[PDB]
Amino acid sequence: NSSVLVFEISSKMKMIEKKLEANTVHVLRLELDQSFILDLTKVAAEIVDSSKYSKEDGVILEVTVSNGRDSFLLKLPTVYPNLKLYTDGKLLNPLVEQDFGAHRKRHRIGDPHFHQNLIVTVQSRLNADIDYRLHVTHLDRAQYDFLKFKTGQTTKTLSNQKLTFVKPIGFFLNCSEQNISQFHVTLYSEDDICANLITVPANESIYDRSVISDKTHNRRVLSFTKRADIFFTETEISMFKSFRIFVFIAPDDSGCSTNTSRKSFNEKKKISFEFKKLENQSYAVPTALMMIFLTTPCLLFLPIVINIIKNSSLHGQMLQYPVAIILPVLMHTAIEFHKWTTSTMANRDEMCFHNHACARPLGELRAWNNIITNIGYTLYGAIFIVLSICRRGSHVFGTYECTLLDVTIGVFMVLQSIASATYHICPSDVAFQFDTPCIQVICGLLMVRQWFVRHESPSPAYTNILLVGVVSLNFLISAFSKTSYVRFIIAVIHVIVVGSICLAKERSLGSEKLKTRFFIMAFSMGNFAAIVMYLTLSAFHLNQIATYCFIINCIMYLMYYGCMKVLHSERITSKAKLCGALSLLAWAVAGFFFFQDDTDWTRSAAASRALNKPCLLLGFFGSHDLWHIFGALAGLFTFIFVSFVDDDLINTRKTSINIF
Amino acid sequence: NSSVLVFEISSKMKMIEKKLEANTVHVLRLELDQSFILDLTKVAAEIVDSSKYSKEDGVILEVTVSNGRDSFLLKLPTVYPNLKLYTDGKLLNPLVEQDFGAHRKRHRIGDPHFHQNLIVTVQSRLNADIDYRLHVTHLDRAQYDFLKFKTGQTTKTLSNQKLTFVKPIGFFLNCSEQNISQFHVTLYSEDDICANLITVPANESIYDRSVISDKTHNRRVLSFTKRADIFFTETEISMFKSFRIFVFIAPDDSGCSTNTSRKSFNEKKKISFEFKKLENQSYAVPTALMMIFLTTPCLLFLPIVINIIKNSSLHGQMLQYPVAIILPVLMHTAIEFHKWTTSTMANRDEMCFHNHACARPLGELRAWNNIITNIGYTLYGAIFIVLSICRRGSHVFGTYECTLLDVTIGVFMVLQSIASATYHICPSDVAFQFDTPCIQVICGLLMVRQWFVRHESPSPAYTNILLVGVVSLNFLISAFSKTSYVRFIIAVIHVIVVGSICLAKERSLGSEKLKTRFFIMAFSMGNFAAIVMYLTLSAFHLNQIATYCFIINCIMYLMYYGCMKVLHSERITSKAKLCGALSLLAWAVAGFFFFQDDTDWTRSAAASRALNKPCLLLGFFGSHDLWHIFGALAGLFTFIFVSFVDDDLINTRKTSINIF
RNA sequence: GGACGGGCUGGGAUGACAGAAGUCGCUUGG
RNA sequence: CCAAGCGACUUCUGUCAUCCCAGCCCGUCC
RNA sequence: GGACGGGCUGGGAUGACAGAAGUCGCUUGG
RNA sequence: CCAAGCGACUUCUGUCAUCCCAGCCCGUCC
Ligand SMILES: CCCCCCCC/C=C\CCCCCCCC(=O)O[C@@H](COC(=O)CCCCCCCCCCCCCCC)COP(=O)([O-])OCC[N+](C)(C)C
Ligand SMILES: CCCCCCCC/C=C\CCCCCCCC(=O)O[C@@H](COC(=O)CCCCCCCCCCCCCCC)COP(=O)([O-])OCC[N+](C)(C)C
Ligand SMILES: CC(C)CCC[C@@H](C)[C@H]1CC[C@H]2[C@@H]3CC=C4C[C@@H](O)CC[C@]4(C)[C@H]3CC[C@]12C
Ligand SMILES: CC(C)CCC[C@@H](C)[C@H]1CC[C@H]2[C@@H]3CC=C4C[C@@H](O)CC[C@]4(C)[C@H]3CC[C@]12C
Ligand SMILES: CC(C)CCC[C@@H](C)[C@H]1CC[C@H]2[C@@H]3CC=C4C[C@@H](O)CC[C@]4(C)[C@H]3CC[C@]12C
Ligand SMILES: CC(C)CCC[C@@H](C)[C@H]1CC[C@H]2[C@@H]3CC=C4C[C@@H](O)CC[C@]4(C)[C@H]3CC[C@]12C
Ligand SMILES: CC(C)CCC[C@@H](C)[C@H]1CC[C@H]2[C@@H]3CC=C4C[C@@H](O)CC[C@]4(C)[C@H]3CC[C@]12C
Ligand SMILES: CC(C)CCC[C@@H](C)[C@H]1CC[C@H]2[C@@H]3CC=C4C[C@@H](O)CC[C@]4(C)[C@H]3CC[C@]12C
Ligand SMILES: CC(C)CCC[C@@H](C)[C@H]1CC[C@H]2[C@@H]3CC=C4C[C@@H](O)CC[C@]4(C)[C@H]3CC[C@]12C
Ligand SMILES: CC(C)CCC[C@@H](C)[C@H]1CC[C@H]2[C@@H]3CC=C4C[C@@H](O)CC[C@]4(C)[C@H]3CC[C@]12C
Ligand SMILES: [Zn+2]
Ligand SMILES: [Zn+2]
């Protein structure tokens, strides 16, 4: 004997059953003629009677497959964290037309005939006979090499393709040949079977870590169940110019869920594909409409404060103004920008989670709408700062001025715009979320303003303590999000803070029946109702509780201040009533749009990727964009109301001003 | 013909030369008898006359190698960023004794004889004859499987092993068999050829990305030239219990340097190995000696301030004290801890850079000495805070009290301890270094104290502006470190700050000849000398310039204050003179030990790993640990001096106190 | 008579690593 | 017509590890 | 007479994908 | 003695792509 056995297999052979005698090697050869051009070939190996090898450790059977141009290795059994399968298969890069010689037309029978070989080798380390099974199946060039676009055709669609642990799928994309500068791919599935979407440059391998020391990350691995999205940017298309796309089913649903119990590692999944060619877009109409909508609100500032300004030691305040309050947002922005710029193109589709049903790209930014919709905060914060500085300028009549604290509120509105724009570059699970804590700070600052407005000029050191508390609460909620008692910690902290506020009110104002008793009663009832609401509903997500509580407390205290003004035989101007009504309406709308967020970092990446909320307006504005815009509007209206409410006391002597 | 040719090769054959005819496959078989147990086999393939294939793209020759237990693929030519080699080789996992049957003794000739096969397959997609070369070499079980320790033997050493792109090296480590709970490996090389150190669990592969979707990081890839260190912790040894270690030469020195011009991708490198078994250590003697040394300094506080305390609206100050100054350090610490805990064992040896010649481990911490040597800052900051609060307590005689600013100084000493301890968990190239900015803040706060001590009580809003400036400078230096004009930006900012300080002095004190003119002259000369020093020396590293400038300016201003006290016919107590002399000496020693840092993130990872500074004292304290300890001592002495210098004016009326 | 553990003793076939003798191929420049 | 690096086996000394095993003896359970 | 580009026309060998007919192996529970 | 999922080819309709090519003609450079 020779220990090496050579077998000639036909092209019609799809299933091969053979017995590997001890210490023997099987070589199987299939001749590939010209009909195998651009045919994606899959080879799978299975061990017959795997129960006889349960006491054996390591690889029991080795299979090598090669067609001359590409190759791979099959090692059985394959070990995954949950299970061990005695079957596995891989894909082979198809042969091209250049592999069969130069014209292939007019075979006048003159130069030699050239063929290609598919070679399969089977080996084992066991000193015993093993029965194995081989599956040799192909995908033709009608389904592989499917991405060919006609003139005027920018979208192609596939539908309902079976997929299994034994039947992977693959596509070839040639951007240079098809004149594609931007490409987007979407996958749709109605069942919840875990699968993987793989994208690689056409000159790279998905199986071989081609060099010992690579550390290059050009391979995309996106686990998905219902939806997956990949976006090829101009930079990536210029860098690589050609790509291969693969979809593989995962043997176990452990990277996609926690409990589905599918029961048989080989199931079928139906997937529909969407291939679209994109071009650079300047969203002129939606941006112009958004700016127009954000502009006419400011017609309330013009007739009063700007007209007053027209009719009309600083160094000891600049050096003592707290400038360290801007630091956390700036460090977070720097860290996020560094993480974004040092990441590769492939990693940006894996580490970031956008609502791709309402994401409009711009260059490398996946969701330009979620970034540009933050301009209202910047505009209103700049207006607040400039107005407060200009409106400065007396000490006997009227309510105490609040210039520095209004400047702080404007500064934090600008910081909110910056932080929310930074967050939407790449939303992920990080130590500091920083999507809406500046709104909490703004609400607290408004509460502080109305608290101290009738005793003195409010100071921005309350900003220091408030910011420390807000950042600590954000970090604590982020760190305990995976546990089951985070909401109880939130409730305990909430109760402590509310009790401290009520005690401070009781000490500052005194125990009069009408003023402090009803304040404490209403505040405690409202906060207890909120705590009951977010403890036993499961409809309130973790990232919304703090913002909702801060907004509710700010609104309640503002309403209390207005009621106290009315009850003390004072007059609220109809302009202030209009500003308050607009603030209430805007806050209600912003909260309604904020509730539709549905963000949860405790679930799997596939569960996150399965979000399918489409745009609401002009194919550009979603629920989150409207939340940004209406939150900015609500902040503006609240600022105008607090600036304008005490206008009836402008001539009243400071000694005769009621305190509450 | 059959297109498949089977060749029987002998064990003596080390070099095989053959011609691959067009559309033919070569199968080469070598029988492996029992003598091949634990023999590490290397197979390399070379294309003869590679100049004939310069117009061909993709893989020209495919080689598969397998011994039944392990396999790999060779695809030629291999493409690296700088060059294309038409030769490559890989390593094969050796066969074990279980692969040849059960006793192998007393062959009474009664059951079958079992052998193993080494199979090599050669294929090509070209329609032309190719000449190729095969190298089959082995490493015996005397060098592979070298890590076997006798009784009482904790260290083994290898020396001067040749290594090439064609002769990789490898070792097997069995922690369970050898009773190893902690393991450390060091590599020494005298030449600067780039190489790679690979560590993998014994059931994993270094070549195959075993599952489509892995994302597991258990493979260590450390590029090195002169030195490399890997540390196996108890957690890793428990998780995996067996490891394989490999060293490969890189074809191009592009991941190790920028300009060496070696000229021939195949050169030899001499490497010496060091294998040591470690046990958990409690460094009782060095820690006790350090604490004793840090304790007796505090005998200066006892006779005066504590004796005074023994002889002896707050809410309006707690709510206005700037608490946002603690935020940047706390967020940096949280981010670093999250990055540390979510990292795998293998990644911690790649992403972190310690001075391994002076790193003492404790659990998973690689350099426990660099962390525990920060306790002096914590102790002295707590002492400063407690002393300042207790010493409070009148308004007509003496210098204005500075309780809140001393509390701030103590708080920032504690923050410095926290930030420096956090930095030494994993020193890397990040957006915010945060190793010594709190020292800069402390120096600035001392300057502010001595600036405002004779006009009013210093306020901690100067802390806000100072911290914003320090953090901005740190980030700016970090972001422009790779350029060639960062020091010019530093010099421009330095000049601006010095000019602003001089102008503020001129405005505050007035243009008298003796006081302000010489102050401006000396300050400008000193800062210009410093700027000239760090602009044209290259001995001052980027991460030291800001700290050195802040320390120098603080010392200069303190000396100026003392000289002004002496010149104004005042008396400095001998105790204050002793405190000042000790502060100067401690600052000099701390600066001397700080200069020996030699940290530069602009160089390659191998250049960073080639640092070999050993411990100076007790095998535990290096230059950096002494820098920590003496910086804490210098801060303590400076604080005592500023607290005690104006003791001669305790009874002097505040109206008769000179201002300077 | 089973036994592989027992030192010892010597032989054997080697295998691979470090330090020392003359033969190929790939590189350039004049 | 020069000088390198690498590669292979003609063969010299430490070595480090394999097994084929040579014998009697101390030797306990068969 | 070279020419592969030219539609058309029909045949051929198919190959692979989606939707419809009865055959193996692996899973359990009673 | 039950019910699933998968796998293979007996064969039915859209299809999608390959080449073997069948002919004359419009046809320009040989
Ligand atoms: C570790 C984890 C984080 C922990 C913290 C987490 C929360 C961090 C948030 C906030 C922390 C800071 C809040 C204030 C602290 C108490 C101060 C106080 O009551 O006294 C002050 C009152 O001043 C006010 O009460 C002003 C309004 C406060 C707005 C902020 C609270 C928002 C409520 C959010 C709703 C619940 C939060 C949402 C929960 C999901 C001043 O006292 P005084 O005596 O009047 O002044 C003395 C001078 N005088 C007497 C002469 C006038
Ligand atoms: C964007 C990138 C970062 C940019 C910033 C980077 C640096 C950030 C660092 C620092 C920024 C902050 C420094 C102070 C700012 C000027 C204030 C001033 O002069 O006036 C104050 C003086 O008070 C002092 O001068 C106190 C001492 C200052 C200590 C800090 C400087 C350290 C020098 C570091 C050496 C160079 C740094 C190292 C370079 C490698 C007060 O003014 P006044 O008029 O007296 O008060 C009015 C009231 N009165 C008149 C009634 C009394
Ligand atoms: C200042 C107020 C109005 C908000 C700022 C809006 C302006 C400055 C923004 C909004 C939309 C933006 C544009 C959106 C799309 C394009 C097309 C592309 O070439 C990138 C830049 C460019 C040209 C942007 C330039 C800046 C832009 C015009
Ligand atoms: C502020 C109120 C009063 C007016 C509203 C401003 C609107 C109409 C303006 C302001 C800035 C403008 C943008 C400025 C520049 C660009 C880039 C150009 O390539 C396409 C149009 C586009 C994107 C404009 C769209 C319209 C735009 C958003
Ligand atoms: C959140 C902020 C902006 C809203 C402030 C709106 C102000 C103007 C509104 C909200 C609550 C209102 C009060 C609610 C209830 C009553 C009781 C009744 O006797 C009529 C007047 C009075 C006393 C209202 C006066 C106007 C009022 C104070
Ligand atoms: C003054 C604001 C900020 C505080 C209270 C916010 C109010 C307006 C918000 C917060 C909770 C919201 C509700 C939450 C749940 C539901 C059920 C579902 O059909 C969506 C809308 C609806 C009916 C929302 C309507 C608007 C809502 C009541
Ligand atoms: C408070 C002052 C004295 C500084 C604090 C020093 C003390 C608390 C530190 C310094 C050295 C430390 C020890 C160093 C080593 C060991 C051995 C091991 O089992 C881990 C914990 C343990 C036991 C540490 C416990 C804490 C420790 C004793
Ligand atoms: C503070 C001055 C006055 C005294 C110096 C304190 C020294 C001697 C003390 C303080 C805390 C002590 C440590 C406390 C606990 C442990 C853990 C134990 O498993 C080994 C000893 C060790 C590591 C001690 C070493 C000595 C130590 C560092
Ligand atoms: C950095 C801090 C802690 C050091 C302060 C040390 C003090 C005590 C020292 C440092 C510089 C010294 C001065 C340096 C020069 C002179 C000039 C001469 O006429 C003697 C006294 C006098 C005026 C010294 C007095 C003491 C002095 C002020
Ligand atoms: C008062 C302090 C903080 C400011 C000045 C620091 C002094 C003491 C430091 C900073 C620069 C240092 C010098 C820098 C360079 C050299 C050359 C070499 O042989 C090492 C030591 C030596 C000779 C150092 C001695 C100490 C040194 C002069
Ligand atoms: Zn947002
Ligand atoms: Zn340090």
Residues packed against strand D, CB within 7 Å: B 12, 14-15, 34-35, 37, 97, 104-107, 135, 137, 140-142, 162, 164, 166-167, 264, 266-268
Strand-pair category, A227-232 with A183-188? antiparallel
Asked whether residue A439 is domain-assigned, the answer is yes
Alpha-carbon dihedral sign for residues A96, A99, A103, A107 = negative
A134 forms beta bridges with A16, A45
Rounded CA separation B157/A207 (Å): 37
Breaks following residues of chain A (C-to-N distance > 2.5 Å)? 312, 393
Rounded CA separation A315/A78 (Å): 72
Phi and psi at B296, nearest 5°, equal -65, -25
H and E: helices and strands count for chain B = 18, 19
Rounded CA separation A86/B12 (Å): 37
Using an 8 Å Cβ cutoff, are A367 and A361 in contact? yes
CA distances A392 to A51, A353, A406, A411, Å, are: 86, 45, 11, 17
Contacts (Cβ under 8 Å, ≥6 apart) of A93 = A67, A69, A70, A244
Alpha-carbon dihedral sign for residues B376, B377, B383, B387 = positive
Phi and psi at A346, nearest 5°, equal -65, -35
Which ligand has the minimum distance to the alpha carbon of residue A638? 5
Other beta carbons within 10 Å of A652: 15
* Closest Cα in chain A, distance from residue B578 (Å): 35
Contacts (Cβ under 8 Å, ≥6 apart) of B361 = B182, B231, B233, B278, B281, B367, B368
Quick one: tokens of A143?
Answer: 């389904």
Smallest CA-to-CA distance from A608 within A344, A189, A220, A227 is with A227
Region label for A152, one of left (φ > 0), alpha (ψ between -120 and 50) or beta (otherwise): left
**Side-chain half-sphere exposure of A495, counting CA atoms within 13 A:** 11
The resolution, in angstroms to one decimal, equals: 2.2
Asked whether residue B659 is domain-assigned, the answer is no
User: Is the beta carbon of B240 within 6 A of some atom in ligand 10?
Assistant: no
Q: Which helix (H) or strand (E) holds A175?
A: helix A175-178
Number of structural domains chain A divides into: 2
Gap from A267 CA to E30 C1', in Å? 26
**Side-chain half-sphere exposure of A503, counting CA atoms within 13 A:** 6
Quick one: tokens of B487?
Answer: 């020091």
Is residue B443 domain-shared with residue B576, that is, in the same domain?
Answer: yes
Which ligand has the minimum distance to the alpha carbon of residue B508? 2
Q: Atom 25, ligand 8: which residue's CA is nearest?
A: B284
Q: What is the CATH number of the domain that holds B207?
A: 2.60.120.380
Is residue B23 domain-shared with residue B78, that is, in the same domain?
Answer: yes
- Residue A309 exposed, middle or buried by CB count within 10 Å (0-12, 13-18, 19+): middle
**What residue type is assigned to position A77 of the chain?**
P
Asked whether residue B561 is domain-assigned, the answer is yes
Boundary-marking domain end, from B280, B295, B330? B280
User: Which residues are in the CB-under-5-Å shell of ion ligand 11?
Assistant: A 420, 435
- Residue B289 exposed, middle or buried by CB count within 10 Å (0-12, 13-18, 19+): middle
Quick one: tokens of A216?
Answer: 């290059």
Q: Which helix (H) or strand (E) holds B628?
A: helix B623-644
- Max distance between CA atoms of chain B, in angstroms, equals 116
Phi and psi at A372, nearest 5°, equal -75, -20
Is residue B350 domain-shared with residue B451, that is, in the same domain?
Answer: yes
H and E: helices and strands count for chain A = 18, 19
Helix (H, G, I), strand (E, B) or coil at B640: helix
* Closest Cα in chain A, distance from residue B385 (Å): 19
- Ligand 4 center–CA A615 separation, angstroms: 21
Using an 8 Å Cβ cutoff, are B7 and B28 in contact? yes
Listed in sequence order, the DSSP H helices in B510-573 are 518-535, 542-567
Is residue B303 domain-shared with residue B438, that is, in the same domain?
Answer: yes
Quick one: tokens of B308?
Answer: 């005074």
Is residue B544 domain-shared with residue B560, that is, in the same domain?
Answer: yes
Asked whether residue B642 is domain-assigned, the answer is yes
Cis peptide before B77 (omega within 30 of 0): yes
Rounded CA separation B98/B84 (Å): 41
Query: What b/e sequence results for A97-122 when a residue is b if at least 16 CB atoms lie within 10 Å of its CB, and e otherwise?
Result: eebbeeeeeeeeeeeeebbbbbbbbb
Contacts (Cβ under 8 Å, ≥6 apart) of A114 = A100, A101, B22, B23, B127
Gap from A659 CA to E22 C1', in Å? 91
Cis peptide before B460 (omega within 30 of 0): no
Helix pair A403-423, A327-341: axis angle to 10 deg: 20
Q: Atom 16, ligand 8: which residue's CA is nearest?
A: B284
Whats the size of chain A, residue-wise? 660
Gap from B107 CA to C6 C1', in Å? 22
Q: Atom 10, ligand 4: which residue's CA is nearest?
A: A288
Rounded CA separation B566/B569 (Å): 6
Asked whether residue B607 is domain-assigned, the answer is yes
Smallest CA-to-CA distance from A59 within B210, B53, B131 is with B210
Helix (H, G, I), strand (E, B) or coil at B11: coil
One DSSP character per residue, A630-642 reads HHHHHHHHHHHHH
Chain A contact set for B208 (CB, 8 A): 73, 75, 207-209
Fill in the DSSP letter of residue A422: H
Is residue B527 domain-shared with residue B639, that is, in the same domain?
Answer: yes
* Ligand 4 atom with minimal separation from the A291 CA: 5
Interface test with B, best of A36, A123, A200 (most B CBs within 10 A): A123
Alpha-carbon dihedral sign for residues A350, A351, A355, A358 = negative
**Side-chain half-sphere exposure of B325, counting CA atoms within 13 A:** 33
Interface test with B, best of A32, A84, A104, A127 (most B CBs within 10 A): A127
Is residue B269 domain-shared with residue B370, that is, in the same domain?
Answer: no
Other beta carbons within 10 Å of A440: 26
Using an 8 Å Cβ cutoff, are A262 and A193 in contact? yes
Q: Quickly tell me which residue has 């110019």 as its tokens.
A: A241
- Substitution site in B281, B282, B285, B287 for ligand 8 pocket (most atoms within 8 Å of beta carbon): B287
A566 forms beta bridges with none
Helix (H, G, I), strand (E, B) or coil at A230: strand
User: Is the beta carbon of A291 within 6 A of some atom in ligand 3?
Assistant: yes
Contacts (Cβ under 8 Å, ≥6 apart) of A383 = A298, A301, A410
Is residue B525 domain-shared with residue B426, that is, in the same domain?
Answer: yes
Smallest CA-to-CA distance from B271 within B195, B187, B341, B393 is with B187
Region label for A412, one of left (φ > 0), alpha (ψ between -120 and 50) or beta (otherwise): alpha
Is residue B50 domain-shared with residue B151, that is, in the same domain?
Answer: no
- Residue A555 exposed, middle or buried by CB count within 10 Å (0-12, 13-18, 19+): buried
Quick one: tokens of A185?
Answer: 């791919």
* Ligand 10 atom with minimal separation from the B596 CA: 20
Using an 8 Å Cβ cutoff, are B85 and B78 in contact? yes
Smallest CA-to-CA distance from A408 within A390, A384, A391, A434 is with A384
Q: Which helix (H) or strand (E) holds A433?
A: none
Is residue B119 domain-shared with residue B176, that is, in the same domain?
Answer: no
Helix (H, G, I), strand (E, B) or coil at A43: strand
Strand-pair category, A87-92 with A220-224? unpaired
Phi and psi at B169, nearest 5°, equal -125, 160
Asked whether residue B107 is domain-assigned, the answer is no
Rounded CA separation B207/B90 (Å): 9
Strand-pair category, A4-8 with A25-32? parallel
- Substitution site in B595, B623, B638 for ligand 10 pocket (most atoms within 8 Å of beta carbon): B595
Strand D bases within 7 angstroms of protein beta carbons: 4-9, 15-21
Q: Cα torsion at B425, B427, B432, B438 (round to 10°)?
A: 60
Strand-pair category, A84-85 with B155-157? unpaired
Smallest CA-to-CA distance from A578 within A321, A297, A212 is with A297
Rounded CA separation A46/A166 (Å): 10
Quick one: tokens of B302?
Answer: 């006892």
Cα A613–chain centre separation: 13
Rounded CA separation B73/B91 (Å): 10
Strand-pair category, B130-139 with B15-20? antiparallel
Is residue B124 domain-shared with residue B191, that is, in the same domain?
Answer: no
Q: Quickly tell me which residue has 């001890």 as its tokens.
A: A22
Other beta carbons within 10 Å of A606: 23
Give the end-to-end CA distance of chain A in Å, rounded to a whole number: 105
Interface test with B, best of A327, A333, A441 (most B CBs within 10 A): A327
**What residue type is assigned to position B404 of the chain?**
L
Rounded CA separation A461/A463 (Å): 5
Q: Quickly tell me which residue has 């008898």 as its tokens.
A: B33
Quick one: tokens of B649?
Answer: 């004016």
Q: Which domain holds residue A54?
A: 1-101+115-140
Rounded CA separation B50/B52 (Å): 5
Chain B contact set for A207 (CB, 8 A): 208-209, 212
Phi and psi at A245, nearest 5°, equal -120, 130
One DSSP character per residue, A57-104 reads -S-SEEEEEE-SS-EEEEEESEE-SS-EESEEEEEEPPB-GGGG-S--
Rounded CA separation A577/A488 (Å): 38
Contacts (Cβ under 8 Å, ≥6 apart) of B85 = B77, B78, B165, B251, B265
Is residue B158 domain-shared with residue B72, that is, in the same domain?
Answer: no
Alpha-carbon dihedral sign for residues B234, B240, B242, B245 = negative
Smallest CA-to-CA distance from A372 within A635, A630, A628 is with A628
Q: Which helix (H) or strand (E) holds A540?
A: none
Rounded CA separation B420/A133 (Å): 61
In SS3 terms, B98-158 reads as HHHCCCCCCCCCCCCCCCEEEEEEEECCCCCCEEEEEEEEEECCCCCCCCCCCCCCCEEEC
Q: Which nucleotide is nearest to B159 (CA to C1')?
A: C18
CA distances A228 to A218, A222, A240, Å, are: 18, 7, 22
Asked whether residue B660 is domain-assigned, the answer is no
Asked whether residue B208 is domain-assigned, the answer is yes
- Residue B259 exposed, middle or buried by CB count within 10 Å (0-12, 13-18, 19+): exposed
